[PDB]
Amino acid sequence: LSNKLTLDKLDVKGKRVVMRVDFNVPMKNNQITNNQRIKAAVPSIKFCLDNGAKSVVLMSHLGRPDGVPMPDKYSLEPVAVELKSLLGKDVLFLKDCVGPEVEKACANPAAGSVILLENLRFHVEEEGKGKDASGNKVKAEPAKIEAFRASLSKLGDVYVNDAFGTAHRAHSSMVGVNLPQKAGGFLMKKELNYFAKALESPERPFLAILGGAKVADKIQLINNMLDKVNEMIIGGGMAFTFLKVLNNMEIGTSLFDEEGAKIVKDLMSKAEKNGVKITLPVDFVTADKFDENAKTGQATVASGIPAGWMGLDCGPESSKKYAEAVTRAKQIVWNGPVGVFEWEAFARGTKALMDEVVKATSRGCITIIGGWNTEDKVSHVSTGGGASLELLEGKVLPGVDALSNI
Numbered sequence: 001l002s003n004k005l006t007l008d009k010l011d012v013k014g015k016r017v018v019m020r021v022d023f024n025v026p027m028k029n030n031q032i033t034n035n036q037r038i039k040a041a042v043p044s045i046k047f048c049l050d051n052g053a054k055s056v057v058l059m060s061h062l063g064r065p066d067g068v069p070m071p072d073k074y075s076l077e078p079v080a081v082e083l084k085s086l087l088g089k090d091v092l093f094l095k096d097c098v099g100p101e102v103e104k105a106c107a108n109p110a111a112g113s114v115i116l117l118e119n120l121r122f123h124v125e126e127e128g129k130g131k132d133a134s135g136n137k138v139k140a141e142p143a144k145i146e147a148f149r150a151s152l153s154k155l156g157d158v159y160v161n162d163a164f165g166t167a168h169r170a171h172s173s174m175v176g177v178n179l180p181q182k183a184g185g186f187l188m189k190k191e192l193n194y195f196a197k198a199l200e201s202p203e204r205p206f207l208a209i210l211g212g213a214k215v216a217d218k219i220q221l222i223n224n225m226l227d228k229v230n231e232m233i234i235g236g237g238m239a240f241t242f243l244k245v246l247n248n249m250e251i252g253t254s255l256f257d258e259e260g261a262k263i264v265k266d267l268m269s270k271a272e273k274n275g276v277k278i279t280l281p282v283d284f285v286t287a288d289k290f291d292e293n294a295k296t297g298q299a300t301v302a303s304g305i306p307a308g309w310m311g312l313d314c315g316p317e318s319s320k321k322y323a324e325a326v327t328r329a330k331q332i333v334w335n336g337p338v339g340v341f342e343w344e345a346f347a348r349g350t351k352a353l354m355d356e357v358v359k360a361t362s363r364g365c366i367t368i369i370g371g372w373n374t375e376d377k378v379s380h381v382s383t384g385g386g387a388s389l390e391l392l393e394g395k396v397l398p399g400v401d402a403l404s405n406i
Contacts, residue, residue: 128172283300
């Protein structure tokens, strides 16, 4: 899937390099709470510098500021401070990504310079559509989109896309850069290679672990995975839709997806025609409200969840059945959490499961994780949850397609 130009074939010596990266990291009080997407870009960045690049200009979005500049909430500045630590190299942060000032700054920087621009999405022209201060839904003008693209195009001599997390987005910085050479990066290459081998020639038994809040937005994924896997865990909030429909479990005020409820039968029938074993949870950590300090409880399918209470984690029997499926696997692809792991009271199911998967990695299992302390404890932690969900659904990655051929 990378019959295209890649960085390892790119002479960057004395070249300015504009690189699209995905530096859209989780944040709390403008404090980065996970730097994995940034660490992930370091190998492409270093190769350019090591190979005598004049400069490396990094460009990413952060969050969804919808085409309005929001420095107070969605600035990449924290990332520039984080990058400098992981690189051992000073990082010039620019408070914009286009226009005369940015263009001067990038025109001919000191050699070995590393520039990080401000959030791309502060301009309506990155996405091609924005919003304003009520619902005010804005359309981007074609001539402004071209001027935006032409301005990014000025900031390097060659272009690199290492933004695997964003590969599913057909945005200006993903598809619009007009440079003769547009190469895929080492991340974009590694991500595509782990998924392509997983999907094209899997080790078996092949286990998919799928979690998430609702069913209806995962049909095509589940559908597609059922054609490939030997086993599948359906975990998290979506499990309650399956359990209501299949077991008439009383689920309290748990998540119930009404659309997906209507096709659960079609999913189980496909699974069964394919000989795929579905593992669903059989017990729960419940809570009197969607809250980190909710009073906790416990339930099984047999007991039901009391009224006013909702399941936010699976219970120890469920973790045990999960572990049994993980033990059988020679290959595991895990996307979506199986409880509200953000909250400690509702983390034990996700942590228990991660321990098994980690342990699986040590006996030689292929473990692909999506999106604590993993990263070296599994085969592949992926930087693109949302991007990789579209890979698995067989969909088009504009960010990969817009790359130069061979």
